[PDB]
Design a protein around this ligand. Structure first.
Ligand SMILES: *[C@@H]1O[C@H](CO)[C@@H](O)[C@H](O)[C@H]1NC(C)=O
Ligand SMILES: [Ca+2]
Length: 434
């Protein structure tokens, strides 16, 4: 797709800190850009929409190539249309924003410049951020994660994409999302199937895969940490059900691991660690700091800070495993106890180290789940299972919670605030900010 300028594109600024082993942290100035899927897509020579509701214009978009040549992405009014605002080192995303139309959530990327994404090499480093999930009830997910996207949004690889990172192109993740309107410089009109439960989305004939590090997927009820390896580390197009993931039929027939080796304290047995109120170790009605360390062995460590008190990831006992570190032993024990083989089949933490050894783009989003109502994160899943079934209970939310239409009408003012992002060598982010 190309870019149009009927609406100016001004990326909201966002500062963050880069720390060093020497003990100092320096302020960096970046900005955020909203994903292309949320943008107005119209004809290059007019205001005629190329996509409307959950269907494409059959005249402007008869096929993927023609559609890409006839259509362009336009600018976004961050605050008024998407409910996205920034203030210093803080970023807030509103759940539902009512303007000329109804907008639900957003997916944003941290930029290095006005035309490029900031790339982070995670291996041997740690990532820290403060978050306020107090306004996120059951069914919502304020996520912060990393994906192996190209810095230019794919412009160098796909000439027909001239919008680039400036317009949030090039997304990919372990689910090999087929709901993307543009992939590899072409539209996704071929094989398009409008969603039967969402009037604004659909599924196309192609998806976009890549490694994904889910550092934070959470609400006020539950939180999970999940690395997702792929046989091909970087962004790669997939076709049909060969994509696997949520959007396809055979979930495990793809190149990526849609499940991952997840770590949810509640799912692992500690039901008093994270929750709303003073009866929980970490009170989700108050802000908290989340630190994630990527050691060179490929293992992942995590600790939290609230009101100046530090709490390491709680200890978990799963089969022959015992500890608080996400490593090979943990992931092997999880597949043995909870079932599955997707993570190991995709290479596990060893294959995932290839992703963290390279650059990954920071993503921050807020979304509700039209496929599984976020039950996999904060409830019993599958819903037919009981508490006696290992790993079935992931949170205290009712199995009837998370209906998109219901949460959107009942909790429109829900929102998430991410702030004070710090990145640097392991052991450096707790030092004085500059
Ligand atoms: C949950 O984790 C916290 C922090 O490590 C700990 O103090 C508490 O004893 C744990 N509770 C259970 C039931 O394991
Ligand atoms: Ca270790």
């Amino acid at each position: 797709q190309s870019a149009c300028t009927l609406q100016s594109e001004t990326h909201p600024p966002l500062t963050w800190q880069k720390c060093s082993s020497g003990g100092t942290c320096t302020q960096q100035t970046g900005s955020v850009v909203i994903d292309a899927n949320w943008r107005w897509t119209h004809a290059t020579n007019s205001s005629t929409n190329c996509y409307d509701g959950n269907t494409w214009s059959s005249t402007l978009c008869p096929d993927n190539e023609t559609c890409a040549k006839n259509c362009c992405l336009d600018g976004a009014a961050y605050a008024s249309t998407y409910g996205v605002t920034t203030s210093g080192n803080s970023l807030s995303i509103d759940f539902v924003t009512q303007s000329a139309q109804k907008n639900v959530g957003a997916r944003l990327y941290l930029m290095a410049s006005d035309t490029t994404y900031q790339e982070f090499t995670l291996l041997g480093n740690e990532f820290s951020f403060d978050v306020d999930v107090s306004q996120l009830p059951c069914g919502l997910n304020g996520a912060l994660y990393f994906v192996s996207m190209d810095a230019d949004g794919g412009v160098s690889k796909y000439p027909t994409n001239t919008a680039g990172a400036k317009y949030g192109t090039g997304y990919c993740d372990s689910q090999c999302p087929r709901d993307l309107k543009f992939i590899n410089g072409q539209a996704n009109v071929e094989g398009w199937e409008p969603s039967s439960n969402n009037a604004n989305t659909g599924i196309g004939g192609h998806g976009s895969c890549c490694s994904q590090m889910d550092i934070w997927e959470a609400n006020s009820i539950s939180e999970a940490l999940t690395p997702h390896p792929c046989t091909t580390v970087g962004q790669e197009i997939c076709e049909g059900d060969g994509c696997g993931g949520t959007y396809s039929d055979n979930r495990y027939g793809g190149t990526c691991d849609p499940d991952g080796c997840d770590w949810n304290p509640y799912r692992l047995g500690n039901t008093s660690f994270y929750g709303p109120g003073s009866s929980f170790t970490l009170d989700t009605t108050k802000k908290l700091t989340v630190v994630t360390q990527f050691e060179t062995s490929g293992a992942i460590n995590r600790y939290y800070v609230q009101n100046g008190v530090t709490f390491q990831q709680p200890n978990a006992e799963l089969g022959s495993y015992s500890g608080n570190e996400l490593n090979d032993d943990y992931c092997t024990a999880e597949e043995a106890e909870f079932g599955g083989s997707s993570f190991s089949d995709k290479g596990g933490l060893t294959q995932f180290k290839k992703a963290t050894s390279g650059g990954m783009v920071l993503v921050m989003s807020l979304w509700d789940d039209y496929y599984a109502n976020m039950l996999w994160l904060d409830s019993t899943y599958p819903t037919n299972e009981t508490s006696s079934t290992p790993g079935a209970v992931r949170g205290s939310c009712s199995t009837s919670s998370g209906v998109p239409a219901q949460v959107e009408s009942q909790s429109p003012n829900a929102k998430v605030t991410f702030s004070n992002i710090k990145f640097g060598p392991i052991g450096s982010t707790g030092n004085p900010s500059g």
